[PDB]
Amino acid sequence: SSKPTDRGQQYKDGKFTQPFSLVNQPDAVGAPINAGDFAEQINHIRNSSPRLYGNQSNVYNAVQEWLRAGGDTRNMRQFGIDAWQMEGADNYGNVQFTGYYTPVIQARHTRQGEFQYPIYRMPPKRGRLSSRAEIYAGALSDKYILAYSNSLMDNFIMDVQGSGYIDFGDGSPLNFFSYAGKNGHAYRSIGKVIIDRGEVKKEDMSMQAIRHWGETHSEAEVRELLEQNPSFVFFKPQSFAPVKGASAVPLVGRASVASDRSIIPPGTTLLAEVPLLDNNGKFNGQYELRLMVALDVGGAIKGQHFAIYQGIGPEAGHRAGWYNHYGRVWVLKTAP
């Protein structure tokens, strides 16, 4: 018998042969520890997607009533809540949990250390003529610099997206910057370049592939590559815009996940025992009972697999990085 337990896998609920198994009562003790966050998450659905809210409020309401009353898994029945245990990837109830987050651009107000890569606001017409290479070489006046970032590649991802969040590190709130304009040069595919060079395989090309490539190469190498795209993007300050997933609903850290729309539709409520990790990123045998809502999707997120949205910034990125563990999940539904 081969039953590994190094990644959080457990084998105390027997074998499952159906995608969803209705349980008398979840094999989980205590109450969810993220009630507050869950309430905030539901509110976001009520305000940002009234159509989805109206389709799942029966579940949200029942769950909320259960939580205020105590939140003990042994008392869910009286609220009409049914718990459907997921089979897991190994058919033993072990569901795959990865992590994901919203990256932030670290920046400073003046050139210093690694922060040598300026992000610009719209310059006058004449200044807009310069190609990327020329701007890199100092074509634009310093007065149009919005911030000095520590990553040329991150600046390019931002160019493609059209917006991004900048963290100046001074404790102030995150600054959101949105599309303001562009230079006079047509863009060229950076993805295409690293493909024709045999750096990345055609099927592996994604924004994350380009992002990762920049992290493992020198700025000199990144600059050389980036210069192949003469287009350049200009930005403007914008009032904060909360991060939304594919359901167009603002995501709340560790209270929302990305899931397979085929087996777990958006708005679906999840009760999960999430494996706890330390600073090193290792499973210590401890679990966390959380309530989460499927509000996003992904290309590599299919089947008995959930990607827990960790939030925004470096801390969230650390958690989202070393996350590839297993836990138990019960879909909560109201008895028809």
Side-chain angles (χ1 to χ4, degrees), residues 162-174:
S163 52
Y165 302 83
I166 276 83
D167 181 350
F168 285 105
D170 56 8
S172 90
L174 289 166

Side-chain angles (χ1 to χ4, degrees), residues 8-141:
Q9 300 114 314
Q10 274 208 342
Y11 306 91
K12 50 197 73 199
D13 291 333
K15 194 189 171 211
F16 299 85
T17 57
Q18 295 303 129
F20 303 103
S21 301
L22 173 77
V23 297
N24 182 239
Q25 71 178 207
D27 183 36
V29 299
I33 59 115
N34 75 330
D37 284 338
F38 178 76
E40 183 187 337
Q41 185 64 89
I42 294 317
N43 198 222
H44 281 308
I45 304 176
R46 195 200 334 271
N47 298 328
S48 312
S49 184
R51 197 215 64 250
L52 180 76
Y53 179 78
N55 286 147
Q56 314 288 144
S57 58
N58 30 108
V59 178
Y60 305 154
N61 285 164
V63 170
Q64 281 291 283
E65 177 75 5
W66 161 57
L67 289 165
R68 180 180 52 177
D72 203 283
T73 55
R74 280 168 344 192
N75 303 317
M76 309 164 81
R77 184 164 303 277
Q78 71 196 83
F79 304 107
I81 298 157
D82 276 324
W84 298 84
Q85 188 160 5
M86 288 176 68
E87 62 183 342
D90 59 355
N91 280 135
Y92 277 100
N94 294 314
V95 170
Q96 196 199 186
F97 281 131
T98 27
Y100 84 109
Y101 74 118
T102 297
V104 128
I105 281 179
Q106 288 292 325
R108 292 289 176 271
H109 292 108
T110 52
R111 223 173 251 284
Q112 70 196 247
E114 301 289 299
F115 307 90
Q116 315 278 324
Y117 318 102
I119 294 174
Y120 297 85
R121 63 181 168 95
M122 281 273 271
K125 283 190 216 305
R126 180 223 297 304
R128 254 119 67 192
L129 263 12
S130 319
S131 60
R132 175 172 298 264
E134 291 163 10
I135 287 158
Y136 280 173
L140 299 178
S141 156

Side-chain angles (χ1 to χ4, degrees), residues 13-14 23 32 48 57 94 122 145 151 164 188 200 230 232 236 241 249 263 270 291 295 305:
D13 291 333
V23 297
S48 312
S57 58
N94 294 314
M122 281 273 271
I145 298 184
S151 168
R188 274 218 256 265
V200 181
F232 197 84
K236 67 187 182 187
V249 169
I263 57 150
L270 310 166
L291 273 164
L295 292 174
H305 181 197

Side-chain angles (χ1 to χ4, degrees), residues 31-330:
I33 59 115
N34 75 330
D37 284 338
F38 178 76
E40 183 187 337
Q41 185 64 89
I42 294 317
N43 198 222
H44 281 308
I45 304 176
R46 195 200 334 271
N47 298 328
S48 312
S49 184
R51 197 215 64 250
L52 180 76
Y53 179 78
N55 286 147
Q56 314 288 144
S57 58
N58 30 108
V59 178
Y60 305 154
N61 285 164
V63 170
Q64 281 291 283
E65 177 75 5
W66 161 57
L67 289 165
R68 180 180 52 177
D72 203 283
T73 55
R74 280 168 344 192
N75 303 317
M76 309 164 81
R77 184 164 303 277
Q78 71 196 83
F79 304 107
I81 298 157
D82 276 324
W84 298 84
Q85 188 160 5
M86 288 176 68
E87 62 183 342
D90 59 355
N91 280 135
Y92 277 100
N94 294 314
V95 170
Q96 196 199 186
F97 281 131
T98 27
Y100 84 109
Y101 74 118
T102 297
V104 128
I105 281 179
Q106 288 292 325
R108 292 289 176 271
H109 292 108
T110 52
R111 223 173 251 284
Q112 70 196 247
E114 301 289 299
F115 307 90
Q116 315 278 324
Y117 318 102
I119 294 174
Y120 297 85
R121 63 181 168 95
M122 281 273 271
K125 283 190 216 305
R126 180 223 297 304
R128 254 119 67 192
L129 263 12
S130 319
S131 60
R132 175 172 298 264
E134 291 163 10
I135 287 158
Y136 280 173
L140 299 178
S141 156
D142 279 8
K143 78 198 270 136
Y144 307 111
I145 298 184
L146 285 169
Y148 292 91
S149 113
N150 67 348
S151 168
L152 210 48
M153 189 52 85
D154 287 351
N155 284 6
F156 174 68
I157 304 282
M158 181 184 175
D159 288 346
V160 179
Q161 291 180 354
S163 52
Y165 302 83
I166 276 83
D167 181 350
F168 285 105
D170 56 8
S172 90
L174 289 166
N175 291 280
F176 186 60
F177 288 89
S178 64
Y179 177 78
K182 207 164 84 63
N183 71 350
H185 297 256
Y187 51 57
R188 274 218 256 265
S189 184
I190 285 302
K192 188 188 130 116
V193 178
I194 32 197
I195 267 170
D196 301 349
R197 277 183 197 188
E199 292 272 0
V200 181
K201 216 101 201 170
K202 217 201 117 104
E203 314 91 60
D204 288 310
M205 190 64 67
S206 66
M207 287 313 295
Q208 249 293 142
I210 303 176
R211 176 175 260 276
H212 182 77
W213 195 94
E215 270 165 343
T216 57
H217 286 74
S218 71
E219 295 280 349
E221 275 153 354
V222 164
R223 183 182 179 163
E224 198 278 320
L225 167 70
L226 260 27
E227 282 181 355
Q228 286 288 293
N229 164 42
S231 166
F232 197 84
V233 178
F234 299 112
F235 304 94
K236 67 187 182 187
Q238 184 81 39
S239 58
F240 194 78
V243 177
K244 298 174 268 231
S247 283
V249 169
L251 313 171
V252 175
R254 282 164 289 174
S256 58
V257 297
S259 73
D260 195 333
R261 203 186 301 103
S262 93
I263 57 150
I264 274 102
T268 289
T269 300
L270 310 166
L271 174 59
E273 281 282 11
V274 190
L276 276 191
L277 315 177
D278 58 354
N279 296 357
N280 186 48
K282 224 133 272 276
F283 170 68
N284 258 265
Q286 282 264 116
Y287 300 86
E288 237 179 11
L289 189 63
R290 294 195 172 253
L291 273 164
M292 311 187 278
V293 185
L295 292 174
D296 214 351
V297 291
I301 313 287
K302 260 101 218 306
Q304 305 280 301
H305 181 197
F306 289 120
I308 296 167
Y309 180 72
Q310 300 293 330
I312 175 164
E315 244 211 296
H318 289 327
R319 300 194 301 266
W322 45 57
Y323 240 114
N324 203 351
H325 303 69
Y326 299 83
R328 278 97 55 221
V329 182
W330 296 265

